[PDB]
């Protein structure tokens, strides 16, 4: 996250920190995700496409730091890794950039709500906030696009939803963005998501409910003028989410 503020997991308790085990036993951060039910985390396929094996991955909930344990965290294995079979990218755009991870602790349990862990509501079919709405993003992504290290404490910021018309202006992204995506950014272009924030939530009030409106997906650079974040538009993926999370 460029700009914004250091926060703690209590303030974004649906946030999932996803890591990969390496040959050697070294563990590195992959991407963010969001807890949408006790057993289910949603993320972005591009995060996993290179190494699509569920056994590689660890999911933490209730965790506020990147490479240190925090009180209230819980650790999970990935029981099912579901990538979108129509995932595709051009030079910049990612289509169907959506993944599901079924989580299970070694003791065979799903998540339990606590002061540090809560699910986030999915929107109803095609139900999105009006453009101009202020939403939140969060993650362990770069604080500056030129940095080589990642912040060790979770960050969040506020960005505003941009109309399709405006985002489909040529000096924005043109026809790179579809009805299956949402653009969001800072009016003054000083705060944004960045590398490392992929798969994490775009969270908006809607129905007076904190709602997973988007998943961090793509953009050109980070915090560049007329170059918003592009998010997978959750309200348009309910059937995919339904046909892949049946109990």
């Amino acid at each position: 996250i460029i700009g914004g503020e250091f926060t703690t997991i209590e303030n974004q308790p649906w946030f999932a920190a996803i890591y990969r085990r390496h040959r050697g036993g070294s563990v590195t951060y992959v991407c963010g995700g969001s807890l949408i039910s006790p057993c289910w985390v949603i993320s972005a396929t591009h995060c996993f496409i290179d190494y699509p094996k569920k056994e590689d991955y660890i999911v933490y909930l209730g965790r506020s730091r990147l490479n240190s344990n925090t009180q209230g965290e819980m650790k999970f294995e990935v029981e099912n890794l579901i990538l979108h079979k129509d995932y595709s990218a051009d030079t910049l755009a990612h289509h169907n950039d959506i993944a599901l991870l079924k989580i299970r602790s070694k003791e065979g349990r799903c998540a339990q709500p606590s002061r540090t862990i809560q699910t986030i509501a999915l929107p109803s079919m095609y139900n999105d906030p009006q453009f101009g709405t202020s939403c939140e993003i969060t993650g362990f992504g770069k604080e500056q696009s030129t940095d080589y290290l990642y912040p060790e404490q979770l960050k969040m910021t506020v960005v505003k939803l941009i109309s399709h018309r405006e985002c489909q202006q040529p000096h924005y992204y043109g026809s790179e963005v579809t009805t299956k995506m949402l653009c969001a950014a800072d009016p003054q272009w000083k705060t944004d998501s960045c590398q490392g924030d992929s798969g994490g939530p775009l969270v908006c009030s809607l129905q007076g409910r904190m709602t997973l409106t988007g998943i961090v997906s793509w953009g050109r650079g980070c915090a560049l003028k007329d170059k918003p974040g592009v998010y997978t538009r959750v309200s348009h993926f309910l059937p995919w989410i339904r046909s892949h999370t049946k109990e």
Binding site: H22, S26, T28, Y29, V30, C31, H46, C47, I49, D50, Y51, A89, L92, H94, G141, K142, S145, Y150, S193, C194, Q195, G196, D197, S198, G199, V216, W218, G219, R220, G221, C222, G229
Partner: peptide
Amino acid sequence: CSRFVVDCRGRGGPCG
């Protein structure tokens, strides 16, 4: 680059 890279296909990343 390496297999230890964070979010290699993310925005601003090598393959974003």
